[PDB]
Design a protein around this ligand. Structure first.
Ligand SMILES: COc1cccc(NC(=O)c2ccc(C)c(Nc3nc(-c4cccnc4)nc4c3cnn4C)c2)c1
Length: 267
């Protein structure tokens, strides 16, 4: 990580809360940045977790992972400073832009998220909280995997049941993210409670296709939701498939049937 001097950082507005501090938008000497602070009184564990987060983030160098600008560790409050993405988090972005993108644009966002996840998994970094709310979107529509902290309905069964978090449980979550993107940010499983979601999964039910969804994309998300972890695609498989679909874009014109929940009869 690069150490940044505090005189170069201007905090401007609060945009969220940290484990023992706040998150701000600000400017870095000017480029806009996001700034997470660790405020006076933090515990030893909080310091270890905070500087540990900075240290792992400093290792990430990929187009589809949030970029660390630097850290303030030599002065108080300590800070983690990242690039700032003006379109914000992906879940809110898509809900505010319903129906505004082409299928190819949506699938391109998924390819980018998958490439970032392949990078993390390859680095032996298990995300554990992959969801559209933890993905940032830049002004080129590039998605940057991030983690803002605390998700039953995004989590694989083995991770819920016995705390087995691996890249393969992240693949399950990625399938949910695919469904979030293709629905413009719908809530997975709609109004079902967390217990009803787990019961449905265990009974064998899976999310139905989004509207206007390429058949290949629904097939892929379905294979991310295999109960048996060993049967799920690896991230390398996901990236490869998405890349090939984008590069032969007529492949995306074949749509999965959408199951009507409502019948409208007209003459
Ligand atoms: C695999 O990737 C990993 C793995 C492990 C850890 C992390 N850590 C971060 O992701 C992280 C840590 C510190 C910062 C300053 C940021 N930046 C932003 N956080 C927030 C925000 C908003 C509300 C509430 N909380 C946060 N909003 C932002 C940014 C940028 N732009 N915007 C709009 C992100 C990433």
């Amino acid at each position: 990580t690069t150490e940044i001097h505090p005189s170069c950082v201007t905090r401007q507005k609060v945009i969220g809360a940290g484990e023992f501090g706040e998150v701000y938008k600000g400017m870095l000497k000017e480029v806009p940045v996001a700034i997470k602070t660790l405020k006076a009184g933090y515990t030893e564990k909080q310091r270890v977790d905070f500087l540990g987060e900075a240290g792992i983030m400093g290792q990430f160098s990929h187009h589809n992972i949030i970029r660390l600008e630097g850290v303030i560790s030599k002065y108080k409050p300590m800070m983690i400073i990242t690039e700032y993405m003006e379109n914000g988090a992906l879940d809110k972005f898509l809900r505010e832009k319903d129906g505004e993108f082409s299928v190819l644009q949506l699938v391109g966002m998924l390819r980018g998220i998958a490439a970032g996840m392949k990078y993390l998994a390859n680095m032996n970094y298990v995300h554990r909280d992959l969801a559209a709310r933890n993905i940032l979107v830049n002004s080129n529509l590039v998605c940057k995997v991030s983690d803002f902290g605390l998700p039953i309905r995004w989590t694989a069964p083995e991770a819920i049941s016995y705390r087995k978090f691996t890249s393969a449980s992240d693949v399950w979550s990625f399938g949910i993210v695919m469904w979030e993107v293709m629905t413009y940010g719908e809530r997975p499983y709609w109004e079902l409670s967390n217990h009803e979601v787990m019961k449905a999964i265990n009974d064998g039910f899976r999310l139905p296709t989004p509207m206007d969804c390429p058949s290949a994309i629904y097939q892929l998300m379905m294979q991310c939701w295999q109960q048996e972890r060993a049967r799920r695609p690896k991230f390398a498989d996901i990236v490869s498939i998405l890349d090939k679909l984008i590069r032969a874009p007529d492949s995306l014109k074949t749509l999965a049937d959408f199951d009507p929940r409502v019948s409208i009869r007209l003459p």
